């Protein structure tokens, strides 16, 4: 039923080239774009870049776009495969590439087509995208997730000293998704005043994901700022905190550098035990219920040890790279208890759904996520609703590559009407 496929190079939220794909069926035009991370784990599927230093400093994706236009498209159009057959189409592309990490076509090439196919399939079935995703995942129910707003940005997403990547607020106590958005927005604007009053205007600019970028070095101060803003907005009893440390970014041959954005000096590196002690104090002093990538993507011993004594949600991101094989190892070792789901870390809609079901079958929570490099595409909004994970992180309530997702979730809630369910306090596992 695929009449035509055409790919093109567009710009992501950081001004870098990325892949966009147009797919046509008798039902019309279906478009999707591909996100790109900044703190990408070594095990992520290959994001194929041109590496032509004269063009976009080597970041062009004309090669990936060409693999689609010259190879994937003609093949998919010939096979006359129906758009509702996501798995068959994804497997075909995976077989055509033939590599473990999608290094021939590029995961960005295959995902772009994979996403466009998924949207087309939904329309073909005459049902909303989230309902289509739900059918593909075998879910009867659908639910609105608690949003996790990254309101203070650090690490590789901002020009400050702050080593840890993301400081998030989750309105688990909200009555529904629209109130969750209200809480998120009001806390964010109050936080702007709190930071301005304490650090000045120069501290109120934003990072890649829309969070403020005060030039502080202390991660604890970031948490204190959140606590103050939450209090000022009056939602202390409805908001908990989440963090993405992105520890692989400051891993230094066994130790960790919490001041990695300053000229290198080994005298300040700390051990994973010392790093864990810091997390323990955070959990003690603030309502931190979730920590993502607390250690390096392959520092397996530290992960197991911390999760065993933590009491909270521990999210694997670079550890698991939305990859069934890495996830399975993590489940067996009890490395963590939550999967960060990033479709472009594995490269296809089908594999992403398999990663999600694998995590869930093992009792893990799943948090759907954007990449620091986003586009106006809103696929993940329907994805998290259809997969019923109950949690999604897709930015601070600032910069439209983030609001496009939150806005779409508002539209999904409205469409669901009075029967719309919201994860709320059951965000870790809206099932049970």
Which residues are known to be catalytic? Answer: 209, 342
Q: Which of residues 242-281 bind Mg ion (CB under 5 A)?
A: 244, 246
What is the H or E stretch that residue 305 is in? helix 300-310
Helix or strand (DSSP H, E) at 149 = strand 149-153
Binding partner of residue 399 among Mg ion, its own copies, none, CB cut-off 5 to 8 Å per kind: its own copies
Helix or strand holding residue 211 (H, E): none
Tell me if 317 is assigned to a ligand binding site.
yes
Beta bridge partners of 18: 10
- Asked whether the beta carbons of 30 and 377 are under 8 A apart, the reply is no
Q: How far is the CB of 37 from Mg ion (least distance, A)?
A: 5
Q: Identify the residue among 5, 7, 20, 84 touching its own copies (CB under 8 A).
A: 20
Select from 268, 325, 329, 399 the one that contacts its own copies (CB under 8 A): 399
Report the C-alpha gap between 245 and 292 in whole angstroms. 6
Kindly identify the residues of this chain, within the stretch 289-318, that bind Mg ion according to CB under 5 A: 317
Q: State the angle between helix axes of 107-124 and 129-137 in degrees (0 to 180), rounded to the nearest 10.
A: 110
Q: Which two tokens stand for residue 322?
A: 């939305």
Residue 382 CA to residue 142 CA, distance in Å, equals 10
Per CB under 8 A, does 10 bind its own copies?
A: yes
Check whether 371 is labelled as a binding-site residue.
yes
Asked if 351 is part of the footprint of Mg ion (rule: CB under 5 A), the reply reads: no
299 is in an annotated binding site: no
Q: What is the DSSP string of 220-247?
A: HHHHHHHHHHHHHHT-TTT-EEEEE--G
HSE, CB side, 13 Å, CA atoms: give it for residue 66: 8
User: What Rg do the C-alpha atoms of the chain give, in angstroms?
Assistant: 21
The binder of 317, among Mg ion, its own copies, none, by C-beta within 5 to 8 A per type, is Mg ion
Distance CA 42, CA 376 (A): 26
Answer for which of 259, 400, 420, 431 binds its own copies (CB under 8 A) is 400
Selection from its own copies, Mg ion, none that 357 binds (CB < 5 to 8 A by kind) is none
User: Which of 312, 401, 412, 423 touches its own copies (CB under 8 A)?
Assistant: 401
Piece of the chain touching its own copies by CB under 8 A; list 38-46, 134-142, 361-369, 410-418: 410-418
**Which DSSP letter does residue 67 get?**
I
Q: Which residues bind its own copies (CB under 8 A)?
A: 8, 10-17, 20, 55-57, 158-161, 181-182, 185-186, 188-189, 196, 200-207, 210, 213, 215, 261, 374-376, 396-401, 403-404, 406-407, 410-411, 414
Residues marked as binding for Mg(2+)? 39, 244, 292, 317
Q: Which residues bind Mg ion (CB under 5 A)?
A: 39, 244, 246, 317
Residues marked as binding? 39, 157, 166, 244, 292, 317, 369-372, 393
């Amino acid at each position: 039923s695929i009449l035509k496929i055409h790919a093109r190079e567009i710009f992501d939220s950081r001004g870098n080239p990325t892949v966009e794909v147009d797919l046509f069926t008798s039902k019309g035009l279906f478009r999707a774009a591909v996100p790109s991370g900044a703190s990408t784990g070594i095990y992520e599927a290959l994001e194929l870049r041109d590496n032509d230093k004269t063009r976009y400093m080597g970041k062009g994706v004309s090669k990936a776009v060409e693999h689609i236009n010259k190879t994937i498209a003609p093949a998919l159009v010939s096979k006359k495969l129906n758009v509702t057959e996501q798995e068959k189409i994804d497997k075909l592309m995976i077989e055509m590439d033939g590599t473990e990490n999608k290094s021939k076509f590029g995961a960005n090439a295959i995902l772009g087509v994979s996403l466009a196919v998924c949207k087309a399939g939904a329309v073909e079935k005459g049902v909303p995208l989230y309902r289509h995703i739900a059918d593909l995942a075998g879910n009867s129910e659908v639910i609105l997730p608690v949003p996790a707003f990254n309101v203070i940005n650090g690490g590789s997403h901002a020009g400050n000293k702050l080593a840890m990547q993301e400081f998030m607020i989750l309105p688990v106590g909200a009555a529904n998704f629209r109130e969750a958005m209200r809480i998120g927005a009001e806390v964010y604007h109050n936080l702007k005043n709190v930071i301005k009053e304490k650090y000045g205007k120069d501290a109120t600019n934003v990072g890649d994901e829309g969070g403020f970028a005060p030039n502080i070095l202390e991660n604890k101060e970031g948490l204190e700022l959140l606590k103050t803003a939450i209090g000022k907005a009056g939602y202390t009893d409805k908001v908990v905190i989440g963090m993405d440390v992105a520890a692989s970014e400051f891993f230094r041959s066994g130790k960790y550098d919490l001041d990695f954005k300053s000229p290198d000096d080994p005298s300040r590196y700390i051990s994973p035990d010392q790093l864990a002690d810091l997390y323990k104090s955070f959990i003690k002093d603030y309502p931190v219920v979730s920590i993502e990538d607390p250690f390096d993507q392959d520092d397996w011993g530290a992960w197991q040890k911390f999760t065993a004594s933590a009491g909270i949600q521990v999210v694997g991101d670079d550890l698991t790279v939305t990859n069934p094989k890495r996830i399975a190892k993590a489940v067996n070792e009890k490395s963590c208890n939550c999967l960060l789901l990033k479709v472009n870390q594995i490269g296809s809609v089908t594999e992403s759904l398999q990663a999600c079901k694998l995590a869930q079958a093992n009792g893990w929570g799943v948090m759907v996520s954007h990449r620091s490099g986003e586009t106006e595409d809103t696929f993940i909004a329907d994805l998290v609703v259809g997969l019923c994970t109950g949690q999604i992180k897709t930015g601070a309530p600032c910069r439209s590559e983030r609001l496009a997702k939150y806005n779409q979730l508002l539209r999904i809630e409205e469409e669901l009407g009075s029967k719309a369910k919201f994860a709320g306090r059951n965000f870790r596992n809206p099932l049970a």
